[PDB]
Design a protein around this ligand. Structure first.
Ligand SMILES: [Mg+2]
Ligand SMILES: [Mg+2]
Ligand SMILES: [Mg+2]
Length: 135
RNA sequence: AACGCCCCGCCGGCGGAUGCCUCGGCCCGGGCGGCGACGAAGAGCGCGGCGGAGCGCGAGACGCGGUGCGGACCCGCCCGCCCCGAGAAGCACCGGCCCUCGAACGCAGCGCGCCCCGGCGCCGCCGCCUCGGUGCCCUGC
């Protein structure tokens, strides 16, 4: 149950916020769970999805694995190579089938200096959280 | 007869009710209470690579600069970016640019002056400079 009176629980307001979010909020809302092996390596659960990493689709009619080749931020959809609509002819450029990030698992992440710094920033902040509860 | 017209059992039109759904309205509470001659509110006309309306902006024009945060895209076609910082989208604050009308300020509204050096509106308060008066006096003549 919510106790913060400054946060709205109105359906109309929540949906309006969802449909008119700015760029960074949209990016954060497009996260996927990390695999068990990646969870052990970095002590985090989810990661914003980015072009260049590998995912596994675990639900829907287009299950599979592939590399992320495009992010459509104003639809909340991604295109992964090899997941296409069935073609009318064998000679036509494939049409990707857009997929929501919340039904895939990240298998391997494309690594940057900025990604490293962001992950390290994340870990050092839930370390305080864990130190402040339990143990 | 037959056709035409009017009434059942299937299939088509025309029209847009109904049902379900809605980033919209309306009411109640809380906060705030901040414009302008340092040129406001409002109006006009312009500004995009391919650009009509709307938003935004002002010849530095569909934006420029600084400081922080952010971290891969940029609705089409293009161009660009890609990196342990090398920087796309976004966000906050600060500094500037700011055409013509408008309280609207050389006159007038699209034309024309004065001036000598650059500048030339009104009203008020304070102060200064230059002056007037058979006002009240005084001196000299
Ligand atoms: Mg236009
Ligand atoms: Mg004028
Ligand atoms: Mg005038």
């Amino acid at each position: 149950m919510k106790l913060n009176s400054a946060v709205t629980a109105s359906r109309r307001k929540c949906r309006k916020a969802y449909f008119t979010a700015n760029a960074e909020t949209r990016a954060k809302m497009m996260s996927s769970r990390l695999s068990k092996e990646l969870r052990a390596e970095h002590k985090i659960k989810t990661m914003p999805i980015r072009r260049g990493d590998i995912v596994e689709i675990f639900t829907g009619g287009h299950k599979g694995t592939g590399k992320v080749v495009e992010v459509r931020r104003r639809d909340y959809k991604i295109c992964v190579e090899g997941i296409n609509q069935k073609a009318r002819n064998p000679e036509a450029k494939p049409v990707p089938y857009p997929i929501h990030p919340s039904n895939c698992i990240i298998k391997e992440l494309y690594m940057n200096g900025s990604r490293y710094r962001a992950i390290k920033r994340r870990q050092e902040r839930n370390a305080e959280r864990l130190a402040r509860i339990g143990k």
